[PDB]
Symmetry: C4
Subunit: 223 residues, 4 copies
């Protein structure tokens, strides 16, 4: 294709690779099958700051999409070619798969948790889990577009942190609801490795619908 | 009215809608009627970063008032028309009501907590609870006005975060005292949904008095 | 004196008033005489973000000294008149006293803790407690001078946050050692109200020595 | 040599001195030989914000290498003379040794923990512990180079915080795996003081390999 382009695909692969390794590696529970204590502030800050870090390392060389729903919302909003966008999802889907892969064999025998495979419960349906995802991936993609929107009062402070903190507060609520994915490839990675696919469809359409509707709302409504 | 104006009312509705859903949804206790553990750092960071996020998404399109006491202090300080300010409170009061609404049916049967309805105890009176609120909503509105005040040394770092962190440290103290509302509509939302109105008046006048006195102090005293 | 000057004294009084109320009010243990759980991350973030907030509200109108050791290091480094500096300590010493004052009667009957009066133990001597303070108030005053030093690469990000985070990591270690004061007036306030003065001298000379040596090192050595 | 140069060596000595004292002093467990509770968010935020603080105090006068692997990656990437780089490691290796030193005698008799000597377990091998380190010190050095790279969109927000948050999320995962060193001198300090050298080689080559490969990837591949 283009060296520029294929660097960015690389950057996209490595970035998911570290995101899901570092932050999924936080879901790890050192007291596997008791107990926890189940620290959200840990899991939550990990996953947000990890993204805030990754966009800081790679933003300038890929975009820091690092999330297929963002990629879908990018294309649906006309920002990335239809063909450019297919070389991202896969690089994001292999990056996660070998991010969790690498993780699997470096974490000991306490992984039992399922490496943290987003799994919808609390007794909720599929539509609830759809919604909880739809809604947050929204709040999150809306953060990305608002903060990354030229011709504004050069938004105060770290753009990476905003997009981080969005992931955060997003985990800071949804974790027991849905897994708090808001990211198809983030849940595609471990699903492959452990074979657990319970309600997996829910983590593609949920986050994608929310991604578009928040791509949409910025572009054609609010601006 | 004006499309500009009515976008901002929309932005105001959606923003409370996500604020109270995401952050009130954090007050949720996964061990309802035991136990907790009652993580403040969770509830606290959630509520601050949520606001820091919302002002980041919408600040540039509404103001990120997202709080009637701020709206009252805005008008009392002559910043927003008397008629503009009535289309905010209601949009903030419906936004909260359907923010909690949406929440009610996505959270399972562990909500028992009361979706987190600010309720004044610790054995305190009503005047204490008035004060604890009055005081913090002050500290908070004073942050908003200080940080959002043109003709200054273009204050270092994220203005959203400052206003976030103010909410934070504000929760980081008052939570067991008062609920740590510092926000009438934030406590108007759930009150409607659950019917629990214990000392509700206390969350309008407290935060409003504090809002004005901190709107006042900036405008006519300190500057 | 001068309205400008006496505004700043006011700003200095109010700022300690909120700092020690909000953050000392975090040391409060809702399970007084069991139990805790003794959350440092709570106490720690409270005290740092509180300062980060206060400098954000008042920095532009007083300096955000909000700490006599800083005031002593300011004067010792020739930055503030000898007479200007005496109207700060007292405004900082009344501000704390009525900050804790106001707190005393708004917190219920769980205050037993001593409103959080910095008290040197762990079995340590007085010189250890001197040092642990001396050292941190150093690390902290060195942050203040480094970050607040014109003619630099206009330091990245919130100057308030840096100075906040310094307080933080400072509490994030010293809390069980010394109380983690690094601030004479912060421990002058509650000491007055509760009458507990155990090793109180240690919180003036410790933090002041550290304040100077870090005022000194910046001014006459490192620069 | 040069006063400029030897100031920076000083700055390098003092900075590790405070980093390892403050943040290693956080690993301290007030319930030594039970129990903990083992707060990661504490240890994690301490170690990141400590670095974020140190680069803020000294960055402008040394570089804020404060980590031999960074120093090796700096030289391997041609940024620092071979002779300049030897006066850093030692200043970083004495700074840590007397940082922990000073700590040893200020912490009481609850230090038992080993002052927090990075020690590779979870049942992992040496190559796993190599990798977990190799990988993170990578993620971390890549943050340093990306954020500190002139000719970019003057990266949003605190550069110190980015480099802080990288340390953070880095601890936020690896702590039970490896100790989460990502820093040879940080683990050289306490090793000297307590005599515990279990897998110590692993904390030089791991972090150094990762340091280079992430120095390399930025310089000769991604840019
Ligand atoms: C498969 C992914 C799911 C599809 C998303 C559903 C929404 C699609 C419809 C929509 O509103 O998107 C906007 C519409 C506007 O794009 P234009 O640039 O005008 O297209 C012309 C150049 N080819 O996008 C058109 O695709 C559809 C698909 C969008 C998702 C991208 C799919 C790539 C991954 C495979
Ligand atoms: C392996 C091939 C990796 C190739 C490396 C880089 C190129 C990336 C694109 C290649 C596509 C990768 C697809 C292979 C994934 C294999 C897979 O599906 O995983 C199955 C899954 C299920 O089995 P276990 O849980 O192990 O159970 C064992 C019995 N109890 O796990 C099996 O490993 C391997 C998982 C992936 C490999 C992870 C090992 C680390 C190797 C990669 C590190 C390299 C990083 C940087 C180089 C990238 C270029
Ligand atoms: C606007 C957005 C438009 C684009 C978004 C989505 C595209 C829509 C197509 C897929 C949506 C329908 C999929 C549902 C079919 C799967 C299903 O329901 O199977 C049943 C169910 C049974 O198990 P449970 O009831 O959970 O528990 C066990 C009890 N015995 O199985 C659950 O899936 C997994 C099946 C794996 C599917 C995941 C693979 C990926 C899905 C493709 C989505 C792709 C979207 C576009 C991306 C571009 C690339
Ligand atoms: C009802 C809300 C409670 C009222 C707040 C109490 C304080 C009011 C008095 C005060 O000091 O406010 C300042 C005073 C200055 O405003 P001007 O622009 O000069 O008014 C002329 C144009 N109409 O404000 C005047 O209203 C009162 C009400 C302020 C709150 C706004 C009410 C909107 C919601 C209903
Ligand atoms: C419902 C109508 C929602 C209309 C949507 C958008 C327009 C916004 C302005 C309309 C004004 C809304 C006022 C209706 C609020 C209803 C109410 O007072 O709630 C009562 C309260 C008490 O009863 P329960 O706790 O359910 O007990 C059941 C028996 N055990 O709860 C009852 O739902 C509904 C609560 C509100 C609806 C929430 C459902 C989600 C629907 C809205 C989602 C749409 C979002 C975006 C579109 C906005 C435009
Ligand atoms: C300067 C600021 C000026 C503007 C600020 C405030 C406006 C002042 C008017 C209202 C203030 C007085 C209200 C007090 C009357 C309510 C009352 O005390 O009722 C008693 C008490 C009995 O219950 P408890 O003792 O708590 O426990 C049960 C034991 N059996 O009831 C408690 O309310 C709830 C009643 C619901 C009131 C909330 C509705 C909103 C109030 C309106 C405030 C509006 C302010 C202006 C906003 C502009 C729009
Ligand atoms: C009492 C507070 C403790 C004193 C601190 C100990 C160090 C003092 C010696 C020192 O090195 O300080 C530097 C020296 C340089 O100041 P100049 O501006 O040159 O003085 C001439 C104008 N009057 O400061 C001179 O005071 C002493 C006292 C400094 C603390 C201020 C005391 C105010 C509170 C009472
Ligand atoms: C009271 C006077 C407050 C004057 C207000 C503002 C002006 C500030 C400078 C005045 C100097 C203040 C010195 C008075 C401090 C009194 C004192 O030493 O406290 C003693 C201490 C020990 O006794 P208790 O613990 O209560 O035990 C009771 C029996 N079991 O506590 C006793 O209150 C009062 C403490 C101070 C008053 C706090 C009450 C809140 C009043 C002030 C709020 C006003 C804020 C803004 C206005 C400032 C201008
Ligand atoms: C360079 C820095 C120079 C300036 C810094 C400091 C100024 C030095 C003067 C004061 C230093 C010596 C003070 C020590 C004397 C107090 C003492 O040791 O008393 C004994 C001890 C006995 O109790 P314990 O052993 O702890 O436990 C009970 C067991 N039965 O008492 C403990 O204090 C409290 C006495 C209260 C003193 C606090 C009042 C403030 C002190 C003034 C310092 C002022 C510095 C300058 C500030 C400018 C304004
Ligand atoms: C001993 C430290 C371990 C060595 C690191 C292993 C990698 C070394 C090989 C490498 O790729 O580094 C790049 C190569 C490029 O440097 P130039 O400036 O071209 O050298 C000419 C001026 N003398 O570096 C050359 O050293 C080796 C050593 C690098 C580490 C520095 C050692 C200092 C501490 C002792
Ligand atoms: C001591 C000499 C310190 C010299 C100060 C500054 C100059 C820096 C370069 C000098 C090189 C320092 C090398 C000496 C380190 C000594 C050592 O290896 O430590 C051994 C180790 C093992 O024994 P223990 O655990 O104590 O067991 C006791 C029996 N149960 O600990 C023994 O102390 C001393 C440790 C180092 C000294 C720490 C004391 C604090 C003194 C330094 C503070 C000064 C700071 C600023 C000045 C720097 C210039
Ligand atoms: C590209 C990077 C190139 C530069 C990087 C590294 C340089 C490589 C040289 C050293 C690497 C080989 C070292 C391994 C030899 C040590 C060893 O394996 O000993 C065995 C093992 C036995 O104990 P365990 O099995 O853990 O448990 C007890 C069970 N009875 O001992 C464990 O070390 C400690 C020995 C201390 C070594 C640490 C001293 C520092 C090492 C030097 C590295 C220097 C690198 C360059 C830095 C420049 C300055």
């Amino acid at each position: 294709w283009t060296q520029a382009f294929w660097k960015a695909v690389t950057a996209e692969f490595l970035a998911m690779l570290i995101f899901v390794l570092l932050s999924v590696g936080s879901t790890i529970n050192w007291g596997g099958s008791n107990p926890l204590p189940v620290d959200m502030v840990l899991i939550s800050l990990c996953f947000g700051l990890s993204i805030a870090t990754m966009v800081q390392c790679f933003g300038h060389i890929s975009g820091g999409h690092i999330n297929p729903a963002v990629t879908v919302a990018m294309v649906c909003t006309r920002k990335i070619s239809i063909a450019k966008s297919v070389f991202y999802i896969t690089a994001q889907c292999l990056g996660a798969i070998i991010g969790a892969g690498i993780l699997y064999l470096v974490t000991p025998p306490s992984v039992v948790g399922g490496l943290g495979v987003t799994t919808v419960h609390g007794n909720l349906t599929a539509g609830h889990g759809l919604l909880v995802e739809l809604i947050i991936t929204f709040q999150l993609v809306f953060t990305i577009f608002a903060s990354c929107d030229d011709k504004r009062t050069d938004v105060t402070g770290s753009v990476a942190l905003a997009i981080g903190f969005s992931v955060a507060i997003g985990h800071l609520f949804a974790i027991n609801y849905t897994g708090a994915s808001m990211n198809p490839a983030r849940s595609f990675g471990p699903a492959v490795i452990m074979g657990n696919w319970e309600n997996h469809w829910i983590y593609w359409v949920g986050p994608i619908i929310g991604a578009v509707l928040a791509g949409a709302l910025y572009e054609y409504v609010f601006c």
